[PDB]
Structures are given as structure tokens and as C-alpha cells.
Symmetry: C2
Subunit: 330 residues, 2 copies
């Protein structure tokens, strides 16, 4: 018996969420459906144009850890906030979910990361992220005991943007593999992949990463192709297990030559896609660490993803375990 | 032409919102459906026990101002936040809605007020409020020109708790009436009424308040009666106009011997009653300052109240003006 099923590592972010029209994104040069990095001045400027907003704890990996805890698994998180009110909110929400979160803040400055997320009428989300205190995450924040005692350690491709987080991840991969655990990553965002394509491929080809999460856009970007079938063949050659999401078309789980197709759940309405991929990973990694089949991991993923997109905010406000019990997936 | 239709004055608060079970309120001796004042120590203690939460700008009068602006009226607000992240959030949200908000923070401590609002399965809300920087609101925060230039100045009964706010209110009343404007209050909460019963009756009887908002519980508390008909007759005798809400039973508007009953909108499901009274006041006061009939003001109030109770959070995320146009209220 081990202390943790899933440790996740990411940019610790609080989300500031508002609805906008399509022209708002165009007028403000915001790349739709993407993570747009911004500096402190741009953050002030954007906020000055944003409508009344709602705040909720975010961070892709943060969301994923919370989702595993919600489903009933044992989760931990590494990610750096500041000693400020936003950081206290982030700390509260993740711990209150029953995630082990012990990363110490280094001061009040830079302040806690925030992301202004604009949701359009079609339910797509466009994120505008000031990394703030995330830039300080480094090898010093690796709790080696936690990595040693987690079945899976999972991290964001997004971590390649801040300067020293990658060093922490290399320490994680070493500790994880020394203790016979598995490493996982998400490709995070298609432009993120464009920035770090070579480095991501190397993580997979060198065996530092065992399980890879991607959506259609990220897989196409990884191989710079318009051919989805080619991307699927190539990603299967590059990592031991690949979980590839395709929005309303569900997901495909690949292992060697094995392919497992899973359907999207029936949805009332796409309210807000924020966290869909994060919660897919929650469902998948929960199933995975519970010894479930890869198909059943896929189903658990589509379930969590389906639930999160029908609400505003990135972390399901309802019991995932209850839904899984109701859905016949338990 | 006047610069403002409605100026509101209240405790400037950010809400921290979570769902709980019935036993949680009992275990923590939280009075259900009430505003429970708390100190800094109790705030920390309650937060430690609270689940994952969502934050949104609140304050009863702040909400009412936001609602007036959403409907298309011209609104202003007085209320005091600290120079901190929560204060920056509050400032952003109210200004982003098109409310004039120019109250200057006086420092970083006490920090910006927050209320931990626990929403039970029945959709009822139980608020736990640390006043923080609200305690510093005083005569120095009265923008004389704003009061002089507002058709109605509306204020919270809740303002009787912090020490100096009442002085600002008496200043508003003098300026408003010197400029031929009208003053309005809400009774806010039945325990608030219990704390300040003599004072509230004096405000009405002396004519410092022209228009009073009450719900059934507040009206019963004001006269310490179980007889609602008695409460209605007495409130009508004590103020020029009284607007009395009865939850699902709608509302009754009283002027001298005139009574105008309005039906509550019929509801799919009550999600979170937070903001119902506040937004009833938004609709009513928007109607009132547009020269509408007392019944139509009640109609507009019930429309806004019905919309806010079908969403999480205290300020409607949808267009009240659009809803009003669809409703033939325009
Ligand atoms: N650069 C980033 N790194 C990690 N997570 C991010 C970044 N930008 C936005 N997010 C988070 O992505 C989540 C949705 O996947 C949001 O909750 C948001 O907080
Ligand atoms: N003491 C208080 N004074 C004014 N408003 C309050 C108080 N406590 C809670 N509220 C606000 O009441 C609103 C709901 O009517 C919530 O948005 C909350 O912020
Ligand atoms: C796999 C995934 O991300 N989940 C989903 C994303 C979008 C979407 C669904 C169902 C309909 C639209 C499910
Ligand atoms: C008059 C008013 O406040 N409107 C309503 C308040 C509460 C409530 C309704 C319908 C069900 C609960 C309508
Ligand atoms: K969402
Ligand atoms: K509400």
C-alpha cells in the first residue's frame, strides 16, 4: 500500500472567469482556445477590459489532482503560490479537496499566478495567464518522499515556460523510476507544444515519460501534420501509453499496436470547456491506479470530462465518485 | 438630467461560496438563513472546515447597485475595501458592471471583508461575515456631489454593525433631502433588525427613510409579531413606501392605504437564494427611478430576484435588461 495514487505537478493558478463575445477576442488579439502568456502590464490592461468575473482555483495539474481526490483516489500536488490572498485561496481549495499540498511560498512577490479566462458563446475558453510566483518553482520544491510514494507522477507541458520547473521534473522522473513508479505528462496546449516540441519528444523517447495525454490539436502540433492518423501512429511509437482526446468524438487509448476507442458521454450543453482535458486525465489516472483496463480508464476520463464542461469553473462541484457509481463504472 | 438613478451604500464584501449538508450548520452553530457576524479567529476556523469554494463579489448593496446597472439604470456605490487582492477584485467587478465606485481604500489592514456563504440542498444560504475594512467606512467616504445627484440613495440595515457607517448615512439623508431626493433602506436580516429595532423605526418615523425594503421574516422581527397582516399594517404606517417580499409568494408594495401584490416568477429549481432580496431591490429601484407604477416596480423586482436564485453567486451573469424586454416590462 502506497501513500499516493497520483502526484501532479504544475503551475499553481487562480482563474478569473468571464463571458465575452467573439469580437472581444479579435479586438484584444487573444488566440481563441489557447493559453496566452501575458506580462504584468498586459494583465492589468486585459483586466481593465474584462467584465464582472468569478474566481476559482485552477492550474491544469491542480484541477487533475482535485479530480482524482473527488473520484476517491489519493492525490498530491507540487506547485508554487505567493504568500498572498490568492495563494491562500489556492492552498485552501486544493487541501480542502483532500489533496496533499505542502509547497511553501517564498514571499509575497511575485504574486500568485492568475489566468483570465474568457468563455465564448460556443463554450470555448481562451486563457490569459500571468505566471507570477510560478516562475519560482524549482528542484527545492520536490518532496522526494512524495514522489517515491506515488504510483503515478503527472506533470504539465506548461511547466516548460517557467525557467526552473523542468529541473524539478527531471528530479521527479529520476526518483519515480528509481522507486518503480510511472511518469506521465500532458502536452497541455498546441502552442506550448510548438515552443517545446523537441524537448517533449525527448522526454518520451528517453523514457522519462511513460504515459502521455494529448488532444487532437496537440498531437497534430507535436508532429506538425494535418493527418490525424499519422499523429496517432507516431505518438504510439514515441511513448508506452498514449491517451488522445478528441472532444465530442471521445478518446482513443493507444499502447503499442492496441487501440481502445471510447465515446463522449451525452451532454446537456457545453457551458464552459475549461478543465475538460484536466478532468479526462483525472478519470484516466484514477482508473489506471485502481488497476482498471485501459478502456475503463478511457470511460472514466470521458465521464469526468463530460461533467466538468457542463459547469462554469475547472473543478467539478459535484461528486465524481457518485456519478461513476451511477454510470456503472464505479 | 441627473447623474445617478440609484446610489447604494453598504458593506463591501467578497463572497466565498460552498455547498454543505444540514449537519454542517448544526455542528458549527451557524444560524441557518442568517447573516452571522464573525471575528478574524472564527473566520480562519470556519474556512479550515469549509470545502473547495468559489469567490465572487458580494455586499448586499453592492449587488443591488450592480443589478440597477445591469437593467440599464445609472448606479453609484459607496463602500470600503482594503488595498489588497480581494479589494482589487471587488473594485474591478462593481466598476466593470458600469457602477460609479470611487471609495478609496485606507490601508491593507483590516483586510477586505469576506463572507463564507454555505448553501444547503434546499438552496438556502447561511452567511458568515468578517467585516474587515468595512469597519472604517465613515462620513469621510460620503461623496456629497454623488448623493446630491442621485434620484434615490439606498442603504443596508447591515451598516448599523460597523461603528461609524451610521454617521455617513445620516450625512447622506441630510444631503439627499436637501436636494429633493429620496432615501431608501433595507432591513437586511431579521437578527440585524433585532439588534437595531428602535433605531430602524426611528429612521422611518423621522422621515430619514422614505422607502423601506423588508422580507416576511424582517417584517415580523421589526414588530416582534407572528401576525404578518399586523406587520404589513404597521410598516405601512411607519414609512411612505414599503416593499415587502414573501419569497415564493411574491411581493406586496404598500403606500398609505394602497396595496399592490405581485406574483413570484415560477421556478425550475432554486439553486442558491443568495442575492434574492438585493436584486428585488435592483428591479424595484430601477422601475421607481424610471417613473414606473408601484406594481411594475414590484414586477421588475420579482423578475430580477427570480433570475438570481437560479444561479450560483449573488450578481446575475445574464442580461437583466434582455430578460425584462422579453417579459414586456422593458
Ligand atoms: N500556463 C499555465 N499552466 C498551467 N495551467 C494553466 C496555465 N494557463 C491556464 N491554466 C489553467 O488551465 C486550466 C484549464 O485546463 C485552468 O483552470 C487554468 O487555471
Ligand atoms: N454584514 C453584511 N453586510 C452587508 N452585506 C452582507 C453582509 N454579510 C453578507 N452580505 C452579503 O449579502 C449578500 C446576499 O444578500 C451576499 O453577497 C453577501 O456578500
Ligand atoms: C474527451 C473530452 O475532452 N471530453 C469532452 C470534450 C468535449 C465534449 C465532450 C462531449 C461533447 C463536447 C466531451
Ligand atoms: C419576491 C422574491 O424575492 N422572489 C423570490 C424569492 C425567493 C423565491 C422565489 C421563488 C422561489 C424562492 C421568488
Ligand atoms: K468548466
Ligand atoms: K444566487
Amino acid at each position: 500500500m502506497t501513500r499516493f495514487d497520483v502526484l501532479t505537478v504544475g503551475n499553481a493558478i487562480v482563474d478569473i472567469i468571464s463571458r465575452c463575445n467573439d469580437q472581444f477576442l479579435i479586438d484584444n488579439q487573444i488566440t481563441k482556445a489557447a493559453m496566452n502568456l501575458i506580462d504584468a502590464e498586459r494583465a492589468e490592461l486585459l483586466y481593465s477590459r474584462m467584465g464582472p468575473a468569478l474566481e476559482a482555483s485552477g492550474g491544469s495539474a491542480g484541477n487533475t489532482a482535485a479530480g482524482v481526490a473527488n473520484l476517491g483516489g489519493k492525490a498530491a500536488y507540487f506547485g508554487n503560490v505567493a504568500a498572498d490572498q490568492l495563494g491562500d485561496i489556492f492552498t485552501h481549495d486544493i487541501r480542502a479537496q483532500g489533496v496533499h499540498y505542502q509547497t511553501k511560498p517564498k514571499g509575497a512577490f511575485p504574486p500568485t499566478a492568475r489566468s483570465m479566462i474568457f468563455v465564448t458563446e460556443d463554450g470555448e475558453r481562451s486563457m490569459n495567464t500571468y505566471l507570477g510566483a510560478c516562475v519560482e518553482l524549482g528542484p527545492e520544491d520536490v518532496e522526494a518522499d512524495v514522489v517515491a510514494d506515488a504510483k503515478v507522477t503527472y506533470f504539465e507541458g506548461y511547466l516548460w515556460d517557467p525557467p526552473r520547473a523542468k529541473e524539478a521534473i527531471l528530479d521527479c522522473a529520476r526518483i519515480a523510476h528509481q522507486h518503480g513508479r510511472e511518469m506521465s505528462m500532458t502536452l497541455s496546449d498546441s502552442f506550448c507544444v510548438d515552443r517545446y516540441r523537441g524537448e517533449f519528444l525527448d522526454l518520451m523517447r528517453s523514457g522519462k515519460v511513460d504515459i502521455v495525454f494529448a488532444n487532437r490539436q496537440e498531437a497534430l502540433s507535436l508532429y506538425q501534420t494535418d493527418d490525424f492518423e499519422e499523429a496517432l501512429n507516431r505518438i504510439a511509437a514515441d511513448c508506452k501509453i498514449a491517451a488522445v482526446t478528441m472532444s465530442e468524438n471521445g478518446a482513443v487509448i493507444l499502447k503499442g499496436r492496441e487501440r481502445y476507442y471510447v465515446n463522449a458521454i451525452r451532454i446537456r450543453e457545453v457551458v464552459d470547456t475549461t478543465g475538460a482535458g484536466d478532468l479526462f486525465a483525472s478519470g484516466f489516472l484514477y482508473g489506471y491506479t485502481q488497476g482498471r483496463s485501459l478502456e475503463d480508464c478511457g470511460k472514466l476520463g470521458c465521464l469526468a470530462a463530460g461533467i466538468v464542461i457542463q459547469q462554469i469553473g475547472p473543478r467539478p462541484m459535484t461528486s465524481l465518485s457518485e456519478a461513476a457509481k451511477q454510470a456503472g463504472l464505479i
